[PDB]
Amino acid sequence: YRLFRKSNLKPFERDISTEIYQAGSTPCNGVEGFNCYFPLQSYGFQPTN
């Protein structure tokens, strides 16, 4: 599930783009770094959960 995204989706819109969301001052165009992270995130789904 996508943790964060630049904008707010209009209703019934799908987003698959996995480009590294850059929130930091430096754009981190290649990979993560200064407040730059992978938009998607997995669930910690568990029977213990």
């Binding site: 964060f4 929130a23 001052s25 430096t26 200064f34 407040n35």
Partner: protein, 49 residues
Amino acid sequence: RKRISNCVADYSVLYNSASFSTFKCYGVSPTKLNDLCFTNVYADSFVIR
């Protein structure tokens, strides 16, 4: 536990600085922090492993 009140909490020099290797807010985003009004702020500082 230092109390912070009646002041502006601008994070222009805090968030944009790369000197902090760990910056994560559990309630709001740093981008929306600058435009969110608050109340009495308590600052707690320590050194750990």
